[PDB]
Design a protein around this nucleic acid. Structure first.
Length: 757
DNA sequence: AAATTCGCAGTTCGCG
DNA sequence: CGCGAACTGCGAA
């Protein structure tokens, strides 16, 4: 199993390293034969002799073109002849590439910005994380001595905890009477012991939570101060910090540093991403939080250190547990994308698609288009029409079916061969024309992206069928993650086409996909009403809800299945409408906002405040109780009684302050805000206290009793003290509860006059 | 930091 | 000083 690749430099020459785990044995393979390169498109041939002359400088010495090779490659489906330029060292490429593009004779250059070690994985057809090799894993966390202001890492590390299959332990340098605590004499000896532990356990994966930006940088600063060689790498190296945007990421050579924080935030949507919040979300069990100030007071007063050690132990324990949950999924993602688990775990959707496509392009001799320059980026700013959304029939409905397209946008892409290399091709025998927008797509040959996407959808179906007859529960799970990631990958192509930064950007393709989508959904709606007497209650992009106005449940169901037979015979190729589900009742508030209930009693909610992480728990809970009484019992009265009991409790100040907290993310640098709403007002005051606020920080605030601008009465919930300040019962009644439930009850005629207290 | 568009809805401010 | 538009956040698909 390949874990990762990198290179080093020996006498000015690059040496690839392949990090592997085979039969339980760590191994490093070395390759001294791989030559860096890029491509150049010239206007003639006699221009190559001049171009080889081109040179630059980096490390004092001169940079030159090692050798040149004329090759034939497809570009956007059309054959092209390009000059491949080889160099001695990968860093030669950034140094000389601009001057070689500057040359009058060179039209363009390509594939000049692919990191050498990823180029190697691609060109050699190597795939990380293949096979069934069990990886040894180790989580760790630290507890530090924090003081207001100071300097980062001015205080010592107080404890280091770790956890794996053998359990969780804490290393510390004060006596703590707990069986999982190992006591040493100083900070230096505690770190040294942790190094020894890592070295003895020899894990393939080190799991942290935010280790990319806290844990490793803390250790690094302390290790310099204490004169420690922090040689976590399997090659004796120290952890390597890389800049990644405005933050950082940390590699440990020969190992995989798996920071759960970027994985979790991209994978689940939570109102906050503290480790306690994530543990509870994923596993449904609370985890106690111990705050910095208590840690510090405990250590400085020598009192109550057991609480601190237990907290530190639990950090490591749950980090290991979250690691076991998420690492298998990311390992399947690494294998699917063909890049290291380290990279893939820290990548966005867009980047994952590009790496997948770069590899497929190499396999098919397809030259990669470049990332857009500034002038091209500006030209990529126009938008286009998206999904079709019907104005809904507001109200409470019974016996409704949801019918939806299976993989609408991928279906369209493959059925109509929608690709930048098939767009407006000249001299083809057959074409498909996008409705409304009119782009023509050649059908004579499979398009680059359509063919890949067809392979993906077919592999996913084969996996799903194998999964049913797989006895081994573990293997079944792995197949589940693989099939799960293929679906997310397949569903990213539409968006990628419209992504201005994408190499295979194609606006005409993006808008032809949505045009076709609108056509098929609207055609299907027209037919079900006109031909089968259904009434379409609500439709958004790729499915709709419908019922037969006066009909029975069995009638709507049976007639739905009949309509599917009818319509699927009319739909071309891979397009397919399916019977998603039957729902006894549904309530449709507005576009994008509804809730439905299946026969078993499960309630599915879309867009409503219940599912928004920026509304108070009291509003959400109350709306969910109103909807349950309506959907589950069709009992309007009981609903109104629920709202009245809630407004009374708020009026009396009986509602737990915790349920009043509003969580809103800071989306930008605090200086960039044009206007300042409450969460911004709060964030600014915290910055002013020296609290750090970066984009992505979640502000959790409560509105205090008072009048005027809400932002002036809002405070961080942690500063809330019931003895000093009362919450604003009026705000939560008038701005949270009533608006959310009111928009539902207006359909039964009830006023906002009602119901109050 | 980065897949897209379609959409609702709260807070604040400034127009007239 | 009412009211609507600007800015804002997040969901949906």
């Amino acid at each position: 199993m390949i874990l990762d690749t990198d290179y080093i430099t020996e006498d000015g020459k690059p040496v690839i390293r392949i990090f592997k785990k085979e039969n339980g044995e760590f191994k490093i393979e070395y390759d001294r034969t791989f030559e860096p390169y890029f491509y150049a498109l010239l206007k003639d041939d006699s221009a190559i002799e001049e171009v080889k002359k081109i040179t630059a400088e980096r490390h004092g010495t001169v940079v030159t073109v090692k050798r040149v090779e004329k090759v034939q490659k497809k570009f956007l489906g059309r054959p092209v002849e390009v000059w491949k330029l080889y160099f001695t060292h990968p860093q030669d490429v950034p140094a000389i590439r601009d001057k070689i593009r500057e040359h009058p004779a060179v039209i363009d250059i390509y594939e000049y910005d692919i990191p050498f070690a990823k180029r190697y994985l691609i060109d050699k057809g190597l795939v990380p994380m293949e096979g069934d090799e069990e990886l040894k894993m180790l989580a760790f966390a630290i507890a530090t001595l924090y003081h207001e202001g100071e300097e980062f890492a001015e205080g010592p590390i107080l404890m280091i905890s770790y956890a794996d299959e053998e359990g969780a332990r804490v290393i510390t340098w004060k006596n703590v009477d707990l069986p999982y605590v190992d006591v040493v004499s100083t900070e230096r000896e505690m770190i040294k012991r942790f190094l020894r532990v890592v070295k003895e356990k020899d894990p393939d994966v080190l799991i942290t939570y935010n280790g990319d930006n806290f844990d490793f940088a803390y250790l690094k600063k302390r290790c310099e101060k204490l004169g420690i060689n922090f040689a976590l790498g399997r090659d004796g190296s120290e952890p390597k910090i890389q800049r990644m945007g405005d933050r950082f990421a940390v590699e440990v050579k020969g190992r995989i540093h798996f920071d759960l924080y970027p994985v979790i935030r991209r994978t689940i949507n939570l109102p906050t991403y503290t480790l306690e919040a994530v543990y509870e979300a994923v596993f449904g069990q609370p985890k106690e939080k111990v705050y910095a100030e208590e840690i510090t007071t405990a250590w400085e007063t020598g009192e109550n250190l057991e609480r601190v050690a237990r907290y530190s132990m639990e950090d490591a324990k749950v980090t290991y547990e979250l690691g076991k949950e998420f690492l298998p999924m990311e390992a399947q993602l690494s294998r699917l994308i063909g890049q290291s688990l380290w990279d893939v775990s820290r990548s966005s959707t867009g980047n994952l698609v590009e790496w997948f496509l770069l590899r497929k392009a190499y396999e098919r001799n397809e030259l990669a288009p470049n990332k857009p320059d500034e002038k091209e980026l500006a030209r990529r700013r126009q938008s286009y029409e998206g999904g079709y959304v019907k104005e809904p029939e507001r109200g409470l409905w019974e016996n409704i079916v949801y019918l939806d397209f299976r993989s609408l946008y991928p279906s369209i892409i493959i059925t109509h061969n929608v690709s930048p290399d098939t767009l407006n091709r000249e001299g083809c025998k057959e074409y498909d024309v996008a409705p409304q927008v009119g782009h023509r797509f050649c059908k004579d040959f499979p398009g680059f992206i359509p063919s890949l996407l067809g392979d993906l959808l077919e592999e996913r179906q084969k996996i799903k069928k194998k999964m049913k007859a797989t006895i081994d529960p573990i293997e079944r799970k792995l197949l589940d993650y693989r099939q799960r990631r293929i679906k997310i990958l397949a569903n990213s192509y539409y968006g990628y086409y419209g992504y201005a930064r994408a190499r295979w950007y194609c606006k005409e393709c993006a808008e032809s996909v949505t045009a076709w989508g609108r056509e098929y959904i609207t055609m299907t709606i027209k037919e079900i009403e006109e031909k089968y007497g259904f009434k379409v209650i609500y439709s958004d992009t790729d499915g709709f809800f419908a019922t037969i106005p006066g009909a029975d449940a069995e009638t709507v169901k049976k007639k739905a299945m009949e309509f599917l037979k009818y319509i699927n015979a009319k739909l071309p190729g891979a397009l397919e409408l399916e019977y998603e589900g039957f729902y006894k009742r549904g309530f449709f508030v507005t576009k994008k906002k509804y809730a439905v209930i299946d026969e078993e009693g499960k309630i599915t909610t879309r867009g409503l405040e219940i599912v928004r992480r920026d509304w108070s728990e009291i509003a959400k809970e109350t709306q969910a109780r109103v909807l349950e009484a309506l959907l589950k019992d069709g009992d309007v009265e009981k609903a109104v009684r629920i709202v009245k009991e809630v407004t009374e409790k708020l009026s009396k100040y009986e509602v737990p302050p915790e349920k009043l907290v509003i969580h809103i993310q800071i989306t930008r640098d605090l200086k960039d805000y044009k206007a300042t709403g409450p969460h911004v007002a709060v964030a600014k005051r915290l910055a002013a206290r020296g609290v750090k606020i970066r984009p992505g920080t979640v502000i959790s605030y409560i509105v205090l009793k008072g009048s005027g601008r809400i932002g002036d009465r809002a405070i961080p919930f942690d500063e809330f003290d019931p003895t000093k300040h009362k919450y604003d019962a009026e705000y939560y009644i008038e701005n949270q509860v009533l608006p959310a439930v009111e928009r539902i009850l207006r359909a039964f005629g009830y006023r906002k006059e009602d119901l109050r207290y």
